[PDB]
Structure formats: structure tokens, C-alpha cells
Amino acid sequence: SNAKRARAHWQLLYTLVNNPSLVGSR
Amino acid sequence: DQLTEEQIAEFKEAFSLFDKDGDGTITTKELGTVMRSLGQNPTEAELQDMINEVDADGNGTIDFPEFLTMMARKMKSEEEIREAFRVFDKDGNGYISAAELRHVMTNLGEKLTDEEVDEMIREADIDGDGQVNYEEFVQMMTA
Ligand SMILES: [Ca+2]
Ligand SMILES: [Ca+2]
Ligand SMILES: [Ca+2]
Ligand SMILES: [Ca+2]
Fold first, then answer.
1. What phi, psi does A14 have (nearest 5°)?
2. Residues of A in contact with B2 (CB under 8 A)
């Protein structure tokens, strides 16, 4: 993991927190 | 959802413009193919940097939730940010701890390691207190 990877991961978690329908297979 | 159903459907269509083989991931070869069809000429290293900007699991390819990071950074909302901060900061003290970040990742079914969580806190932690406050959270989400 790196600083670019960290920021990408925070923003992914933000998308997933705001859009529960994107979690999981469907 | 923050995004409407029409939006998610639309962005899935955009994603499949790159994911031409429909396997659910965008590779540097797929990214390069689209970019050269639009008249560009990225190097293989520049294709890697583009994927690395949004690659959240480090597998070298872009899946659909990662693709939405490009879509959000493409063109841009401060009440959604406060509300999302509260989901992370579960004991309400205004600081996201490593344990509270792990809890968000667990609730989302994200696999986690200490190395990745400690790196995430470190990179966000501007003031050096070992946790992420609200203004540190804003800088991370909006950049
Ligand atoms: Ca593909
Ligand atoms: Ca990925
Ligand atoms: Ca807290
Ligand atoms: Ca801090």
C-alpha cells in the first residue's frame, strides 16, 4: 500500500458508504 | 443511495465502453485501447499511473466501484460529507480511529489488513494525532 493507494481506498469507502447497493456481488 | 438508479445504470454503460470483454474489470490494455481511439497516445507507464490513481485493492485493474472514483473526480455537496463522517466516527468524538475505520471496512465486506488501515490513517492524518478529524476527512474525500 502507498499514498496513492490510500487515497483511492478512502474514496472507494466513501462511495460504498453513500451507495449501499454497490456492496457485494450485485 | 446517493446516486440515482439512472445514474448507476448510466455509469455502468460508460464502464463497459472500457471493459469491452465484459469480465468486470478495466485493464491497462483496455484503457489504452479507448484512449487511442480518442486520438491520444499514452505510454504504458502513464496507463499504470491512471489505474493506480483509483486502484483501491491494488490488483492492477479498475472494477466498477473503483471506476466511480474516476467519475466522481471527473466533475464534482458538504452535507453528504458531514453525514458520511458520522458513519465512520461511531463514538461521536469527532475523530476516526483505526478501530472505527476497520469497523466500516468490515460492515462493507472489505477485506482488511493492519498495514492497509494504518497507511490510510497515516496519509489522512495531517495534524499527526493518530486519528482523522473532519477537516482531514474532507481533504481525503474531495481529493
Ligand atoms: Ca475487461
Ligand atoms: Ca482494483
Ligand atoms: Ca471516534
Ligand atoms: Ca489527525
1. -65, -45
2. 18-19
